[PDB]
Amino acid sequence: AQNKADVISKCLDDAGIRNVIDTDSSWAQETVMFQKRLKPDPEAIAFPENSDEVASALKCARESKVKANALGPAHSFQGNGFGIPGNLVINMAAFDEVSYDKKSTLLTFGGGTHVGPVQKYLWDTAGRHVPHVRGAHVGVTGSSIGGGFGTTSRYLGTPMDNLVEIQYMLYNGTIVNAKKGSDLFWAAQGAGASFGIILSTKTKTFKPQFDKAINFTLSMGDLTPEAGAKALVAIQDYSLSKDCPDTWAFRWNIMAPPYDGTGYFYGNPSSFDSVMAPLVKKLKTISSNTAVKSTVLPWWDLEVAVAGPGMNQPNGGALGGRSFYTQSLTTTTDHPLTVKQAQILFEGTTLAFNRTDMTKFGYMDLWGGVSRSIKDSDTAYAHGKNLWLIRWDANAIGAYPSDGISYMRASIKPFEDSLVKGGAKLRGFVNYADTELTEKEWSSRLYDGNFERLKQIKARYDPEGLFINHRQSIPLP
Ligand SMILES: *Cc1cc2c(cc1C)nc1c(=O)[nH]c(=O)nc-1n2C[C@H](O)[C@H](O)[C@H](O)COP(=O)(O)OP(=O)(O)OC[C@H]1O[C@@H](n2cnc3c(N)ncnc32)[C@H](O)[C@@H]1O
Ligand SMILES: *[C@@H]1O[C@H](CO)[C@@H](O[C@@H]2O[C@H](CO)[C@@H](O)[C@H](O)[C@H]2NC(C)=O)[C@H](O)[C@H]1NC(C)=O
Ligand SMILES: *[C@@H]1O[C@H](CO)[C@@H](O)[C@H](O)[C@H]1NC(C)=O
Ligand SMILES: *[C@@H]1O[C@H](CO)[C@@H](O)[C@H](O)[C@H]1NC(C)=O
Ligand SMILES: [Cl-]
């Protein structure tokens, strides 16, 4: 109905809740998101100042038979900040509180907070850290319910795994604290938007063991495709050996030629060269152009380098954005990559890429480390024993080309086939969800054998399906 907006806006007006609809003059300014390939088209946007107003917005959505959709800082690569067109979007910006409990060492952050100010408050107040995504403007809540693997996650774990309590407002306005060990908390670790509006969240915190830490580059230049594949398999072997500490981090670009990457080291700075020596020795046997450059930085200066100048600003900086389409696969330590699989990946993606209307953007992050003690059943998003996080992407120079998606999906299909051929099952990463997958595909790749349990929790907490608000929302059984 094309007067649905009118009934909703009058419902919200009567509840004292600031809101806009597409006849408001600020509609354009309030419908902005990071992903430019998709166009936001909510039915209305509410701006609750407190939990009572969130409850009143939920009732309004139910009364007009529309879905409810939380809007954080708008970073979703899938457009989920606004969701499927026709939602009542609930803008969470007022929920910006952050507080630290120095007795428990738990940090509490509101449902609309950004990474930068949460980290800076914790660092300035207590000299402590919480693993986080590589963008100070990103929503802490949104990024944490979708995984959030960051540079410190090989030794400190992921943002999602370090949560301990989530304060939910459910579809009927009831507030509940979901604690670690419960079904609602388990479901929120991978599918949090499907169960309610998150008002605040508590997380573990950590003390860095050294004042300074290291950012490095590793470069091997222009290699043959076979030599590039050997190099990746050698990096993998090092990462699985006794020579690689969990305080290491490394991102291997999928941009070749050239072959190179960027990494970090969070152990004792003077140990760096001995940590890297076994890796460099092996890579030198593949190419003499192997070269490592490194810098020692104070803890916070390195954090600003990783996640941007917004780390120092009260809203975490600027949104930015471009037009792109993300694909992403994860693999585990039960299926280390072969030289053939590494070559097929690069041959089909970055080495074949020949568009002049898009610019390729690919990389694979070394996971591993403390993922070794995680089981796929421990959290809704199955990531036990993850070893690689692979992202293959491309951003449009202008508008996104009509054949871009089919071109990009065909690029990496041979690699997917090769993973299956060697006996792996295809897996994904929620924050890098692939908008083009069927339900059978994304449910298998994100939730594998947790999916049936996830749907039973969904019926318990959202029987009306009010929060079935994006393409990969958990359905009712
Ligand atoms: C823009 C961006 C994203 C990003 C990144 C760097 C930048 C510049 N770096 C990342 C990284 O290093 N690692 C990673 O895993 N992801 C990274 N991202 C992606 C980002 O984490 C995800 O896109 C994330 O979903 C963004 O969340 P944010 O909250 O900022 O964005 P949103 O579009 O408005 O909302 C995303 C989804 O989460 C739900 N949500 C958000 N807040 C709530 C609350 N309070 N309650 C319930 N659900 C909530 C939204 O409904 C939507 O589904
Ligand atoms: C590690 O990160 C630092 C901080 O960003 C990099 O230092 C910058 O280096 C460029 C030139 O390479 C200068 O123009 C910047 O002014 C530097 N910034 C600071 C704060 O010093 C450093 O190059 C990185 N080290 C690597 C990649 O090995
Ligand atoms: C670009 O790549 C596509 C995909 O294989 C191919 O069909 C096309 O001929 C290529 N164009 C050029 C100029 O190489
Ligand atoms: C609100 O919904 C939850 C979700 O099932 C339910 O447990 C609770 O009883 C409901 N509360 C009220 C007051 O209806
Ligand atoms: Cl030091």
Side-chain angles (χ1 to χ4, degrees):
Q2 272 232 351
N3 69 357
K4 230 172 201 92
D6 297 316
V7 173
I8 293 167
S9 180
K10 202 238 191 313
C11 186
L12 299 170
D13 286 351
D14 290 338
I17 298 167
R18 176 171 67 99
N19 67 89
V20 299
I21 46 175
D22 60 15
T23 56
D24 273 288
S25 77
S26 64
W27 185 250
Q29 280 62 49
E30 303 290 3
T31 51
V32 183
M33 65 179 184
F34 184 82
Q35 175 56 265
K36 305 304 180 179
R37 175 171 64 84
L38 305 170
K39 188 176 180 308
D41 190 24
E43 215 63 78
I45 302 165
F47 301 85
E49 295 281 342
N50 61 39
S51 66
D52 281 358
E53 296 193 347
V54 176
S56 290
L58 297 173
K59 185 165 175 59
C60 287
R62 295 173 70 196
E63 291 184 5
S64 273
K65 299 182 314 103
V66 294
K67 309 298 194 176
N69 194 100
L71 172 58
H75 272 268
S76 177
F77 299 169
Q78 308 74 23
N80 297 345
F82 289 88
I84 294 160
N87 298 337
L88 176 20
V89 166
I90 298 168
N91 181 311
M92 294 299 290
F95 290 87
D96 65 354
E97 277 183 35
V98 58
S99 70
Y100 178 63
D101 183 333
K102 68 182 183 166
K103 300 307 174 176
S104 62
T105 76
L106 295 179
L107 181 69
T108 301
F109 56 93
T113 50
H114 311 254
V115 165
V118 168
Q119 298 289 327
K120 189 172 196 298
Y121 166 92
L122 179 64
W123 178 252
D124 290 349
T125 299
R128 290 177 83 88
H129 167 80
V130 172
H132 57 81
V133 299
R134 310 190 195 198
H137 189 250
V138 180
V140 188
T141 306
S143 64
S144 294
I145 61 176
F149 184 93
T151 62
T152 57
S153 288
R154 296 193 63 252
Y155 75 113
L156 300 181
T158 66
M160 190 184 78
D161 286 330
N162 283 317
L163 307 181
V164 300
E165 190 171 332
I166 299 173
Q167 180 181 46
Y168 262 108
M169 176 164 290
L170 299 178
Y171 79 97
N172 53 14
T174 294
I175 297 180
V176 299
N177 297 297
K179 302 199 93 199
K180 189 167 183 182
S182 65
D183 285 356
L184 182 53
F185 184 86
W186 175 87
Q189 287 177 306
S194 284
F195 302 91
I197 304 295
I198 300 173
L199 304 172
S200 67
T201 301
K202 298 187 191 318
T203 180
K204 298 176 179 173
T205 64
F206 304 92
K207 198 200 189 322
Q209 291 317 319
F210 300 85
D211 285 324
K212 297 170 188 165
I214 283 170
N215 56 319
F216 70 94
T217 57
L218 189 158
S219 167
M220 296 180 75
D222 298 334
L223 301 166
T224 67
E226 296 80 12
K230 288 177 197 241
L232 175 53
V233 175
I235 292 159
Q236 181 176 258
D237 192 56
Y238 166 79
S239 90
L240 292 170
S241 77
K242 62 169 175 58
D243 297 326
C244 181
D246 288 355
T247 45
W248 201 62
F250 190 63
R251 169 173 290 187
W252 185 241
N253 289 323
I254 305 167
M255 300 286 285
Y259 291 83
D260 56 18
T262 58
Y264 305 91
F265 176 63
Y266 294 105
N268 191 329
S270 60
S271 297
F272 181 72
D273 277 350
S274 79
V275 164
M276 294 286 286
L279 176 64
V280 173
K281 179 173 220 202
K282 183 52 178 203
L283 294 174
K284 288 291 198 168
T285 72
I286 298 168
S287 171
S288 291
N289 292 322
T290 300
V292 174
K293 299 286 174 196
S294 65
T295 309
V296 183
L297 297 176
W299 181 264
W300 187 250
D301 290 324
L302 178 60
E303 283 284 88
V304 171
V306 165
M311 286 296 274
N312 296 316
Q313 290 289 309
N315 298 286
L319 177 57
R322 44 199 190 187
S323 192
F324 59 105
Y325 157 64
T326 309
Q327 291 174 94
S328 170
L329 301 157
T330 55
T331 63
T332 74
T333 60
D334 294 320
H335 310 284
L337 302 176
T338 67
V339 168
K340 184 156 181 186
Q341 289 170 334
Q343 194 165 328
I344 286 168
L345 171 58
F346 274 62
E347 278 180 333
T349 57
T350 178
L351 301 175
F353 191 94
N354 69 354
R355 313 281 301 196
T356 57
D357 59 355
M358 303 188 290
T359 308
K360 64 191 176 187
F361 182 39
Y363 58 81
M364 47 196 300
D365 286 316
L366 179 68
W367 199 318
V370 298
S371 74
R372 64 175 69 83
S373 59
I374 304 177
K375 307 196 107 185
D376 281 338
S377 65
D378 286 345
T379 54
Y381 163 52
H383 63 285
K385 295 183 290 179
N386 273 6
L387 180 66
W388 291 106
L389 174 52
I390 298 157
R391 175 171 175 193
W392 174 237
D393 214 316
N395 43 84
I397 293 181
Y400 199 86
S402 158
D403 66 324
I405 292 179
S406 50
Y407 176 96
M408 296 290 285
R409 295 186 71 195
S411 291
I412 196 163
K413 181 66 162 46
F415 177 59
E416 298 185 13
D417 292 340
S418 80
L419 290 183
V420 172
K421 178 172 181 182
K425 320 288 162 331
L426 298 173
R427 303 157 69 88
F429 182 67
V430 176
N431 284 344
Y432 300 168
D434 182 343
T435 54
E436 308 306 290
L437 299 180
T438 67
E439 186 180 296
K440 182 147 211 292
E441 281 170 336
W442 58 255
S443 63
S444 174
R445 292 187 197 186
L446 297 177
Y447 304 116
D448 70 68
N450 303 325
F451 191 52
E452 291 304 317
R453 179 184 178 195
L454 199 53
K455 297 189 283 169
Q456 294 300 314
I457 299 164
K458 171 70 182 186
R460 180 171 127 208
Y461 285 106
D462 185 24
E464 300 186 348
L466 182 64
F467 300 109
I468 302 178
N469 54 33
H470 70 275
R471 193 149 158 199
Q472 297 190 8
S473 292
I474 308 306
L476 291 164

